[PDB]
Amino acid sequence: MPRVKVQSVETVEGCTHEVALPAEEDYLPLKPRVGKAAKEYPFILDAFQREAIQCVDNNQSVLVSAHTSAGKTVCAEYAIALALREKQRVIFTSPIKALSNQKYREMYEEFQDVGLMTGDVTINPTASCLVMTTEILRSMLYRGSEVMREVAWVIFDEIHYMRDSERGVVWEETIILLPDNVHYVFLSATIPNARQFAEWICHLHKQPCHVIYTDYRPTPLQHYIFPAGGDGLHLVVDENGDFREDNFNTAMQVLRDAGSNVFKIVKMIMERNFQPVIIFSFSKKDCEAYALQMTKLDFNTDEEKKMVEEVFSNAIDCLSDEDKKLPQVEHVLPLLKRGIGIHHGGLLPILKETIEILFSEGLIKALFATETFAMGINMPARTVLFTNARKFDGKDFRWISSGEYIQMSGRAGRRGMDDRGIVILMVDEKMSPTIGKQLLKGSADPLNSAFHLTYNMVLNLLRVEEINPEYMLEKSFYQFQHYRAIPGVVEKVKNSEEQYNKIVIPNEESVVIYYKIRQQLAKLGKEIEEYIHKPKYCLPFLQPGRLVKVKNEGDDFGWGVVVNFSKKSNVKPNSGELDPLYVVEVLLRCSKESLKNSATEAAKPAKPDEKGEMQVVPVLVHLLSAISSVRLYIPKDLRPVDNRQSVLKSIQEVQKRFPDGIPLLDPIDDMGIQDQGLKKVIQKVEAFEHRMYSHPLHNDPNLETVYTLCEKKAQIAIDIKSAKRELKKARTVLQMDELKCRKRVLRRLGFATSSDVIEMKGRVACEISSADELLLTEMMFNGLFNDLSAEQATALLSCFVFQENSSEMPKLTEQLAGPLRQMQECAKRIAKVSAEAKLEIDEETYLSSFKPHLMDVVYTWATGATFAHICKMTDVFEGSIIRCMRRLEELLRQMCQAAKAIGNTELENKFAEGITKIKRDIVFAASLYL
């Protein structure tokens, strides 16, 4: 159980300052800085700037949360200066290697003493500033690597990136394995759940942590909406924040009644000098499709074209003669002559930073960007546009979330260069007046960790003799956030039991028995209803006008006439299909709010406070809770309003003719059922209702009140039962059940003994941190790497770094695919070992995890083939091919120093030679910044 508290020190008309204090720690107010500022800044700093500099002056860990355009790095350059003034080395981490290059560039330009440490490049590993990616920090911590002996300040930037289930999990280990003598600085975007992370840090390592939150913006933003088809922009929210509902209503009405465009948008936008401009498309094919669509427009001046050509000539010198003739550069240069460009994940790694720097200088006035451009890149623009609203995440096709929208919209507006920021949005189909307005008022996202288990983690902690995984589990943020609900759970249980005790006055238990029989009667009623509507005897009884009733357990729609029905089966059946379903098109009375959007759930019938409107709605066959024996006449051809109003009137007089209740059917005779067993159930229902009315309580009045009281107390009891069921798992073998399952497998393989101590069989596994090492150790130990040539073995390892689906499967030769089965057969046997240890592994994706699409491309490249000649045998973008080998080349780096573990060198030097003849023409070249 954690023991912390919050003081929330006052702030004068600025930001909001809170401090986390661990349990018994009295709050000492911050003393003013003594001495001289370690770095002067030419401008005036904000209130939260003052507070942050004051806090860092006291050598205290801090959390700051604000938009990216605030310039948080201005604080950080101060802190990195201070340890430089005090002669202490500073460690800086970045999530992706991409930003590390230019960040090292700035920190080299003004401080002149920094050190770069990437997986591929190591520059000056003797400096007071080491800039290095976090996973390298994890590897460094797992090794002895006694560099932390002298460091005390750590900077974490863009921390909100911890929203992935796959690769976010590492930073918990990185943070936990750090010592308790260091100080921290945390940079974050606007976060609702800011406090809980701070409390987790305060409890984790015995230190206070300041927290700063604000939403001040130097440049306010303006939002407009453009329906698909029309002219003009509707300002919905402005530099003041009012919603201006009228404009939104006008836009949705225009799209509803209306139910080259991009060229018209760009043409209008360029007119009033609103460059630069950025667009966001989630399909990289459409980025180039609109790039070619834009080839009829020019922005550059003659001097600008001269400058772009000269800088291009400077850039392409190192490219070497053969590489200068690639088709892609010949495509882009005419596009660049007009002032437009693209940026996606299939472009060359050399063209990217060229485009970025040319955008920085200020010549290109129209850039097309994919999702991974707003993240990173400290270069903002003047206006922002979105071409879509739905996108495929990788598992389904879903709408955009609030956080993505805010993150991408935050790039509009430059301090001083432009007065206001402009962001535009379009909608084309199924806007659904309900969803979409949240995108303009919702916050970005609450941050929540996932922290799945992995083999390398438990192996590495087993390598440490004084640390064990079970100690690690309770320290994870998962357990911390699960511990912030227990007080709420116990408070809920306490309030519920007290409420149950408050209202207790039944008389007597005969009411309880009358309830129980009234539930058996109900269960019998549903069990016979499950027989009356089976689609064998009820299909001839579905004429138009049958006055059916529908209740899908949530609400009563009422009485409605049947219009049509069909045996339409499930098209594209999810998880197969073995029973046919039926859909009945029946005319119900829906609400106005349900019709006005009519795309979200086709639900929420009209309420007795509204007159409502009737429309035909498709329903499932298993929802008809009543079949009547009356057939109202139906108009001829219909589809207006007045005749449906007459149908409403008709259903209204017919109810004025059977005040006792409409005669629905008789299950014994009307259908004609002759099936054994239904006689037993009708006998039982007749019996139960016989004694039901035979009861005296029934005659007694006020029965309904007591019925409601019993229903309420039963629901309270159900709630208490569920709350106790949840509370019976507050901290009860959470992800420690898999721990036994995970630890069980290791001893079977031989990685560990039953005594659960690392052996050299497991020690080679701890020295791998990129791919699934368990099978790799089997490959090395079973002896499959030997008798494999270097040229044919490097392509084998490429299956561990490729995880993207492709349309076509090329044919592979026996010498190249013989090991492929050899790889696959060893996968199956290991999967069985996992499957027999109660682990939830399915052995269809497991073999599909390694995708055998590009081994030959790896093989052909390491045969003397030219890059130009090699990108024509597969339907994969060249850029996507290029960065794939980064992990593979990184993998080969650690494999060479992996075979030097069991005293094997014949295999070791083979991989070393393979690495040397990879870096040949274009794929491995220093960044324009390096």
Concise summary:
By secondary structure, the protein is an alpha/beta fold. 41% of the residues lie in helices and 12% in strands.
Structure description:
The structure is cut from a larger assembly and holds one chain. Helices cover 41% and strands 12% of the residues. The strands form 4 sheets. A 10-stranded mixed beta sheet has the order 1-2-10-3-9-8-4-7-5-6, sandwiched between helices. Strands 12-11-19-16-13-15-14 form a 7-stranded mixed beta sheet, sandwiched between helices. Helix 4 packs across helix 5, helix 25 crosses helix 26 and helix 27 runs antiparallel to helix 30. It has 33 helices and 24 strands. The protein is α/β, with parallel strands linked by helices. The relative contact order is 0.07. It is globular. Belongs to the helicase family. SKI2 subfamily. It is found in: Nucleus, Nucleoplasm; Nucleus, Nucleolus; Nucleus; Nucleus speckle. It comes from Homo sapiens. Keywords: Acetylation, ATP-binding, DNA damage, Helicase, Hydrolase, Isopeptide bond, mRNA processing, mRNA splicing, Nucleotide-binding, Nucleus, Phosphoprotein, rRNA processing, Spliceosome, Ubl conjugation.
